[PDB]
Short mmCIF file of C-alpha atoms in Angstrom, two decimals:
data_model
loop_
_atom_site.label_atom_id
_atom_site.label_comp_id
_atom_site.label_asym_id
_atom_site.label_seq_id
_atom_site.Cartn_x
_atom_site.Cartn_y
_atom_site.Cartn_z
CA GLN Q 1 17.07 -7.85 45.57
CA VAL Q 2 14.97 -6.64 42.51
CA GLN Q 3 12.09 -4.83 43.32
CA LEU Q 4 8.80 -4.48 40.90
CA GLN Q 5 7.08 -1.18 41.80
CA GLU Q 6 3.55 -0.47 40.81
CA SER Q 7 1.54 2.83 40.89
CA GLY Q 8 -2.02 3.88 40.01
CA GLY Q 9 -5.32 2.33 41.07
CA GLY Q 10 -7.87 4.01 43.42
CA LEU Q 11 -11.39 5.11 43.10
CA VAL Q 12 -12.82 5.16 39.35
CA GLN Q 13 -16.38 5.67 38.29
CA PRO Q 14 -17.61 2.86 35.90
CA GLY Q 15 -17.14 3.98 32.28
CA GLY Q 16 -13.63 5.61 33.44
CA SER Q 17 -9.79 5.05 32.32
CA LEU Q 18 -6.70 4.55 34.35
CA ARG Q 19 -3.26 3.99 33.55
CA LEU Q 20 -1.33 1.10 35.78
CA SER Q 21 2.57 1.45 35.65
CA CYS Q 22 5.11 -1.01 36.98
CA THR Q 23 8.73 -0.35 37.06
CA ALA Q 24 11.68 -2.49 37.61
CA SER Q 25 14.17 -1.29 39.44
CA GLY Q 26 16.95 -3.86 39.38
CA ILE Q 27 16.14 -5.83 36.35
CA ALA Q 28 15.50 -4.23 32.80
CA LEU Q 29 13.05 -4.90 30.09
CA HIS Q 30 12.81 -5.77 26.75
CA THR Q 31 14.87 -8.96 28.22
CA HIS Q 32 12.25 -10.33 30.12
CA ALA Q 33 8.29 -11.32 29.61
CA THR Q 34 6.16 -9.25 31.68
CA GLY Q 35 2.59 -9.59 32.82
CA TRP Q 36 -0.28 -8.42 34.72
CA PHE Q 37 -2.31 -10.86 37.24
CA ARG Q 38 -5.51 -9.83 39.06
CA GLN Q 39 -6.96 -10.97 42.38
CA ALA Q 40 -10.35 -10.60 43.59
CA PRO Q 41 -11.65 -11.36 47.43
CA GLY Q 42 -13.33 -14.70 47.63
CA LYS Q 43 -11.39 -15.66 44.23
CA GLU Q 44 -8.22 -17.12 43.11
CA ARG Q 45 -5.80 -14.88 40.92
CA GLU Q 46 -6.13 -14.68 37.27
CA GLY Q 47 -3.67 -13.05 34.68
CA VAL Q 48 -4.85 -9.82 32.52
CA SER Q 49 -1.99 -9.44 29.93
CA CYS Q 50 1.57 -10.02 28.44
CA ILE Q 51 4.55 -8.98 26.64
CA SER Q 52 7.22 -11.34 25.66
CA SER Q 53 10.89 -10.23 25.79
CA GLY Q 54 11.67 -9.46 21.46
CA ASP Q 55 9.41 -6.81 20.57
CA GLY Q 56 6.59 -8.33 22.29
CA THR Q 57 3.51 -9.80 21.04
CA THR Q 58 0.74 -8.75 23.51
CA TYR Q 59 -1.84 -11.68 25.01
CA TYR Q 60 -4.71 -10.77 26.53
CA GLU Q 61 -7.40 -12.84 28.20
CA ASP Q 62 -11.06 -13.76 27.47
CA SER Q 63 -12.62 -11.17 29.38
CA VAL Q 64 -10.24 -8.39 28.90
CA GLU Q 65 -10.38 -8.43 25.07
CA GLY Q 66 -10.86 -5.10 23.19
CA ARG Q 67 -11.15 -2.84 25.96
CA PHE Q 68 -7.58 -3.14 28.03
CA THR Q 69 -4.19 -2.27 26.28
CA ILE Q 70 -0.89 -3.03 27.34
CA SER Q 71 2.59 -1.00 26.26
CA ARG Q 72 6.14 -0.92 27.34
CA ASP Q 73 8.59 1.75 27.40
CA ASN Q 74 12.20 1.08 27.46
CA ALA Q 75 13.18 4.69 27.70
CA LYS Q 76 11.62 4.81 31.17
CA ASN Q 77 11.53 0.70 31.96
CA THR Q 78 8.29 0.86 32.62
CA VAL Q 79 5.32 -1.01 31.74
CA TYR Q 80 1.65 0.54 31.33
CA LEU Q 81 -1.41 -1.23 31.39
CA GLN Q 82 -4.35 1.28 30.27
CA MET Q 83 -8.05 0.35 31.66
CA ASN Q 84 -10.37 1.71 29.41
CA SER Q 85 -14.42 1.07 29.64
CA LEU Q 86 -14.47 -0.63 33.15
CA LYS Q 87 -17.47 -2.53 34.02
CA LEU Q 88 -18.47 -2.96 37.95
CA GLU Q 89 -16.70 -6.57 38.41
CA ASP Q 90 -13.35 -5.76 38.51
CA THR Q 91 -13.16 -4.25 42.02
CA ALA Q 92 -10.18 -5.92 42.74
CA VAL Q 93 -6.16 -5.65 43.35
CA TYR Q 94 -3.44 -5.90 40.50
CA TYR Q 95 0.01 -7.33 40.51
CA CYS Q 96 2.94 -6.96 37.73
CA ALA Q 97 5.41 -9.77 37.66
CA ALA Q 98 8.34 -10.60 35.12
CA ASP Q 99 10.25 -13.95 34.01
CA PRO Q 100 13.28 -14.54 32.00
CA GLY Q 101 12.97 -15.42 28.30
CA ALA Q 102 9.55 -15.30 25.75
CA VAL Q 103 7.42 -17.50 28.45
CA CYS Q 104 3.83 -16.07 27.15
CA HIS Q 105 2.30 -18.51 24.78
CA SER Q 106 5.27 -20.20 23.39
CA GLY Q 107 3.84 -23.92 22.56
CA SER Q 108 1.09 -25.43 24.56
CA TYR Q 109 1.69 -22.94 27.32
CA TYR Q 110 0.30 -20.00 28.67
CA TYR Q 111 0.67 -17.34 31.15
CA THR Q 112 -2.53 -18.38 33.55
CA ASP Q 113 -0.09 -20.66 35.31
CA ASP Q 114 1.33 -18.44 37.93
CA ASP Q 115 4.82 -19.49 38.05
CA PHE Q 116 6.77 -15.82 37.91
CA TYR Q 117 9.86 -15.22 39.79
CA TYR Q 118 9.82 -11.43 40.35
CA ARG Q 119 6.47 -10.19 41.89
CA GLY Q 120 5.05 -7.27 43.67
CA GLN Q 121 3.07 -5.57 46.36
CA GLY Q 122 0.03 -4.37 43.65
CA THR Q 123 -2.40 -1.56 43.68
CA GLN Q 124 -6.15 -1.70 44.52
CA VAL Q 125 -8.40 -0.74 41.62
CA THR Q 126 -12.26 -0.07 43.07
CA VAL Q 127 -15.37 0.88 41.05
CA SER Q 128 -18.38 1.89 42.90
CA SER Q 129 -21.24 4.72 42.63
CA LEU H 1 19.87 30.67 -30.67
CA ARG H 2 19.40 28.27 -27.60
CA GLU H 3 19.88 24.46 -27.56
CA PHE H 4 18.99 22.12 -24.97
CA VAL H 5 19.05 18.48 -24.35
CA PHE H 6 16.34 16.65 -22.29
CA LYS H 7 17.07 13.15 -21.16
CA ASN H 8 15.20 10.37 -18.82
CA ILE H 9 17.25 7.52 -17.33
CA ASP H 10 16.26 5.74 -14.07
CA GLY H 11 14.46 8.54 -12.69
CA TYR H 12 16.66 11.66 -12.86
CA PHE H 13 15.90 14.60 -15.00
CA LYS H 14 18.70 16.74 -16.54
CA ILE H 15 19.20 19.87 -18.45
CA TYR H 16 21.84 20.53 -21.15
CA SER H 17 22.07 24.02 -22.73
CA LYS H 18 24.11 26.54 -24.24
CA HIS H 19 23.61 30.61 -25.36
CA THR H 20 25.43 31.75 -28.03
CA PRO H 21 24.19 34.83 -30.00
CA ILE H 22 26.19 34.04 -33.33
CA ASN H 23 23.96 32.79 -36.00
CA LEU H 24 24.25 35.25 -38.94
CA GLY H 25 22.16 34.55 -42.11
CA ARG H 26 21.64 31.01 -41.24
CA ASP H 27 19.29 29.31 -39.20
CA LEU H 28 21.43 26.51 -38.47
CA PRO H 29 25.16 27.89 -38.83
CA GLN H 30 28.11 25.93 -39.11
CA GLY H 31 30.30 25.46 -36.13
CA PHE H 32 30.80 23.31 -33.03
CA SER H 33 29.93 24.08 -29.40
CA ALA H 34 29.39 21.81 -26.12
CA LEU H 35 26.40 22.19 -23.94
CA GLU H 36 26.87 23.67 -20.72
CA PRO H 37 24.82 21.65 -17.85
CA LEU H 38 22.69 24.14 -15.87
CA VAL H 39 20.28 22.59 -13.43
CA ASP H 40 19.70 19.08 -11.96
CA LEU H 41 16.17 17.41 -11.48
CA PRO H 42 15.01 14.87 -9.18
CA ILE H 43 11.57 13.67 -10.20
CA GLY H 44 11.41 10.12 -10.72
CA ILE H 45 8.27 9.73 -13.16
CA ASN H 46 8.42 8.42 -16.71
CA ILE H 47 7.89 10.34 -19.74
CA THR H 48 5.76 8.92 -23.01
CA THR B 1 24.04 -1.71 -3.55
CA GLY B 2 22.30 -1.11 0.07
CA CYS B 3 20.44 -2.50 2.96
CA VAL B 4 17.10 -3.83 3.39
CA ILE B 5 15.63 -3.27 7.30
CA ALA B 6 12.45 -5.03 8.52
CA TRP B 7 10.69 -5.18 11.81
CA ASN B 8 7.53 -6.66 13.06
CA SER B 9 4.46 -4.46 13.82
CA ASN B 10 1.67 -6.78 14.51
CA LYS B 11 0.92 -4.11 17.71
CA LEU B 12 0.24 -1.28 15.48
CA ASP B 13 -1.47 -2.22 12.19
CA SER B 14 -3.34 -5.34 12.85
CA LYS B 15 -6.79 -4.43 14.16
CA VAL B 16 -9.41 -7.07 15.84
CA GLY B 17 -11.30 -7.06 12.47
CA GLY B 18 -8.54 -7.24 10.34
CA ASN B 19 -7.02 -4.40 8.35
CA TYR B 20 -7.83 -4.00 4.58
CA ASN B 21 -6.58 -0.86 3.62
CA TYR B 22 -3.21 -2.72 2.81
CA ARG B 23 -3.04 -3.47 -1.26
CA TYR B 24 -0.90 -5.29 -3.53
CA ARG B 25 -0.90 -6.38 -7.63
CA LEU B 26 -1.21 -9.74 -8.04
CA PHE B 27 -2.35 -9.91 -11.66
CA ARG B 28 -0.36 -7.92 -14.28
CA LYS B 29 0.38 -8.26 -17.69
CA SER B 30 4.01 -7.31 -18.00
CA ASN B 31 6.80 -7.14 -15.23
CA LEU B 32 8.28 -3.70 -14.17
CA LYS B 33 11.45 -2.47 -14.79
CA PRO B 34 13.16 -1.49 -11.13
CA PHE B 35 12.39 1.43 -9.46
CA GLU B 36 8.91 1.72 -10.82
CA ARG B 37 5.70 2.24 -9.59
CA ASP B 38 1.92 1.09 -10.99
CA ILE B 39 -1.01 2.62 -9.11
CA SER B 40 -3.31 2.52 -12.36
CA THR B 41 -6.29 0.19 -12.02
CA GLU B 42 -7.62 -1.89 -15.15
CA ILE B 43 -9.50 -4.62 -15.60
CA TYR B 44 -7.19 -8.02 -16.06
CA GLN B 45 -7.38 -9.91 -19.39
CA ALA B 46 -7.33 -13.14 -17.94
CA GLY B 47 -9.12 -15.38 -20.69
CA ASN B 48 -10.16 -14.66 -24.39
CA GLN C 1 -18.67 -4.44 -6.85
CA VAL C 2 -17.82 -8.13 -6.21
CA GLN C 3 -20.91 -10.34 -6.03
CA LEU C 4 -21.05 -13.90 -4.85
CA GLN C 5 -23.73 -16.25 -6.50
CA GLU C 6 -24.85 -19.49 -5.28
CA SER C 7 -26.75 -22.22 -6.88
CA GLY C 8 -28.45 -25.67 -6.11
CA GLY C 9 -30.65 -26.38 -2.92
CA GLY C 10 -34.23 -27.41 -2.51
CA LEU C 11 -36.16 -30.28 -1.33
CA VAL C 12 -33.98 -33.43 -1.07
CA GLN C 13 -34.65 -36.66 0.56
CA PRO C 14 -32.52 -38.22 3.35
CA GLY C 15 -29.89 -40.22 2.52
CA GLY C 16 -29.18 -38.44 -0.70
CA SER C 17 -26.74 -36.27 -2.15
CA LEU C 18 -26.39 -32.66 -3.72
CA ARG C 19 -23.66 -30.39 -5.57
CA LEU C 20 -23.91 -26.78 -4.18
CA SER C 21 -22.08 -24.19 -6.17
CA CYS C 22 -20.69 -20.66 -5.51
CA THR C 23 -19.23 -18.49 -8.32
CA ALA C 24 -17.51 -15.19 -7.72
CA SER C 25 -18.03 -12.18 -10.38
CA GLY C 26 -15.38 -9.63 -9.56
CA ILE C 27 -12.74 -11.66 -7.60
CA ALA C 28 -11.11 -14.62 -8.58
CA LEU C 29 -10.16 -17.94 -6.57
CA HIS C 30 -6.72 -19.46 -5.93
CA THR C 31 -5.91 -16.18 -3.89
CA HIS C 32 -8.88 -16.06 -1.68
CA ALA C 33 -9.85 -18.36 0.89
CA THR C 34 -13.50 -19.76 0.54
CA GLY C 35 -15.66 -20.90 3.22
CA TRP C 36 -19.30 -21.97 3.68
CA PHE C 37 -21.50 -21.27 6.93
CA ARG C 38 -24.73 -22.78 7.50
CA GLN C 39 -27.57 -21.28 9.54
CA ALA C 40 -30.92 -22.71 10.65
CA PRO C 41 -34.21 -21.09 12.49
CA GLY C 42 -33.60 -21.49 16.38
CA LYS C 43 -29.99 -21.38 16.27
CA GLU C 44 -26.54 -19.43 15.33
CA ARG C 45 -24.59 -19.70 12.38
CA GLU C 46 -21.93 -22.20 12.00
CA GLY C 47 -19.17 -22.75 9.72
CA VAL C 48 -18.92 -26.09 7.23
CA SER C 49 -15.76 -26.10 5.34
CA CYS C 50 -12.90 -23.96 3.68
CA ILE C 51 -10.42 -24.02 1.27
CA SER C 52 -7.20 -22.03 1.49
CA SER C 53 -5.66 -19.54 -1.09
CA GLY C 54 -2.68 -21.92 -2.47
CA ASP C 55 -3.09 -25.13 -3.62
CA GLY C 56 -5.66 -25.79 -0.77
CA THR C 57 -6.06 -27.55 2.40
CA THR C 58 -9.43 -28.85 3.32
CA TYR C 59 -10.65 -28.24 6.89
CA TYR C 60 -14.28 -29.57 8.06
CA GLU C 61 -15.90 -29.56 11.03
CA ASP C 62 -16.70 -32.13 13.77
CA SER C 63 -20.58 -32.49 12.75
CA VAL C 64 -19.45 -32.85 8.97
CA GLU C 65 -16.46 -35.05 8.69
CA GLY C 66 -16.35 -37.77 6.28
CA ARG C 67 -19.69 -36.89 4.62
CA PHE C 68 -19.01 -33.64 3.04
CA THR C 69 -16.36 -32.66 0.53
CA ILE C 70 -15.39 -29.74 -0.99
CA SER C 71 -13.25 -28.71 -3.90
CA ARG C 72 -12.68 -25.77 -6.33
CA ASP C 73 -12.32 -25.47 -10.03
CA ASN C 74 -10.38 -22.58 -11.30
CA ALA C 75 -11.41 -23.44 -14.65
CA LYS C 76 -14.83 -22.02 -14.23
CA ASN C 77 -13.91 -20.14 -10.76
CA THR C 78 -16.57 -22.14 -8.86
CA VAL C 79 -16.45 -23.70 -5.48
CA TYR C 80 -18.18 -26.86 -5.18
CA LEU C 81 -19.69 -28.38 -1.75
CA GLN C 82 -20.91 -31.94 -2.26
CA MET C 83 -22.71 -33.24 0.58
CA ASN C 84 -23.86 -36.82 0.84
CA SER C 85 -26.04 -39.06 3.14
CA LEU C 86 -27.80 -36.18 4.57
CA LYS C 87 -29.78 -36.25 7.86
CA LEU C 88 -32.71 -34.57 9.28
CA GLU C 89 -31.11 -31.97 11.52
CA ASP C 90 -29.27 -30.58 8.18
CA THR C 91 -32.16 -28.64 6.95
CA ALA C 92 -30.73 -25.03 6.59
CA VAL C 93 -29.51 -22.17 4.29
CA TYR C 94 -25.86 -22.16 3.20
CA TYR C 95 -23.90 -19.22 2.37
CA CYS C 96 -20.46 -18.90 0.47
CA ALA C 97 -17.98 -16.46 1.91
CA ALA C 98 -14.46 -15.02 0.64
CA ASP C 99 -12.00 -13.61 2.72
CA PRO C 100 -8.42 -12.35 1.55
CA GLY C 101 -5.53 -14.35 2.57
CA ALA C 102 -4.94 -17.90 3.86
CA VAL C 103 -7.52 -16.85 6.84
CA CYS C 104 -8.39 -20.94 7.65
CA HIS C 105 -6.26 -22.10 10.32
CA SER C 106 -3.21 -19.84 10.14
CA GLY C 107 -1.58 -19.61 13.54
CA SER C 108 -3.93 -19.54 16.42
CA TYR C 109 -6.57 -18.48 14.47
CA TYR C 110 -9.41 -20.60 13.12
CA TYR C 111 -12.54 -19.74 10.66
CA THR C 112 -15.24 -20.53 13.46
CA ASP C 113 -15.38 -16.49 14.07
CA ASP C 114 -17.53 -15.19 10.94
CA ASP C 115 -15.71 -12.12 9.95
CA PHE C 116 -15.39 -12.72 6.10
CA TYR C 117 -15.22 -9.64 4.05
CA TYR C 118 -17.51 -10.95 1.25
CA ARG C 119 -20.81 -12.52 1.76
CA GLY C 120 -23.73 -13.95 -0.34
CA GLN C 121 -27.65 -14.56 -0.08
CA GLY C 122 -27.57 -18.31 0.26
CA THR C 123 -29.51 -21.04 -0.72
CA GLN C 124 -32.00 -23.37 1.31
CA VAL C 125 -31.93 -27.15 1.62
CA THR C 126 -34.61 -29.09 3.12
CA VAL C 127 -34.43 -32.76 4.33
CA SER C 128 -38.08 -34.16 4.84
CA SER C 129 -40.33 -37.13 4.25
#
C-alpha cells in the first residue's frame, strides 16, 4: 500500500529550469534504488536517471547527459530531479519508481528494462512557445 | 635577569621562563633556580 | 592511536572532463617524518 | 611547461614498417597513460593504442589489431609505436598524448573519448606508389 507521489511539471519555456520531486510514503530512501522514467505520446517509455541504495552512484541516459541532475534528500525522504536547459522534444510525462537493492548497472544490466515494483502517477512537463 | 627555554617537538611550541631580580656584580651569578612554564603555543611548523 | 574515516564522493568532485586540481608528490628525495607537510616545488634529480 | 615531441613519419611504401617515437620533456613516463590518435582529411580523429601507468596493459583498436605494436622505454622516457604491413588507407597524421592516471579502460570508461590533458603537434605518414 506504499505510494510514490510526484510534484512539479507544467508549462515551462525552452531554456528554463524545473525541479521534479518524488516522495515515498511507506518505504524509505537510501535503501532502495530510485529511477525516473519518461513516456512520450506515440513512443515507448525510456528512463531518465537513477540513484542506487548505498550512497548512490548517479546514472544518466545518453540524451540527457550534462543537463539533467539528480539528488536524494534523506531528511525529507525525497528524490529531486533538476531540469536545466530544456529543448523542445521533451514534452512528455515523467514517472518515478523504486526497486529494492542496488539494481542500476550492477553487471550487464541497466535500468532501461522497466521491471520496477513501486510506481507512480506521473506529472506532465510541457515546453512550448 | 631573564631566562627562557624554547623547544620544538611534534609541532608543539613551549615557553619556559623565570624572572629573578638578583644578579649582583656577576653577570652569570651562582645559584640554582627552576624555570616556570608560562604559555603554550600550538603552531606545527619546523624551525631550522 | 586514533581512527580513519572515508566515504566516496564521486557525485561532488568528479566533473565530466575530469578534475585536475588534485595533486600529490610521487617523486621525492627523502621519506618524511610523521605529521609533516611538503608544499615546495623543486626539480627532481632523477639522473646524473 | 610540458611539451611532447614526435619523431618519425614520411613516405613509406605499402607493406613497409616504421617506428614512431614520442618523448616527454617535462613529465615522466611509467606514471602517466600514453595513447596515440590518428587523423586523416575528410574524417574525424580516431585512437590507435594506449599504455597504462603501472607495467602497462596494451590496448589496440579494431582496425589495427595484430599489425601495430606499442612499447615504452623508461631508460629513454620514450614511447614507441611500431607499425608494420601498412595498407593504403593508413595515410594520416599521428599525435601522441599523455593523461594522468591509468585512464585507458578503467571501469566503464575507455580512451576513445579524446580528452587527454597533454597533446602534441603530430607527424604525417603517407603510403603511396
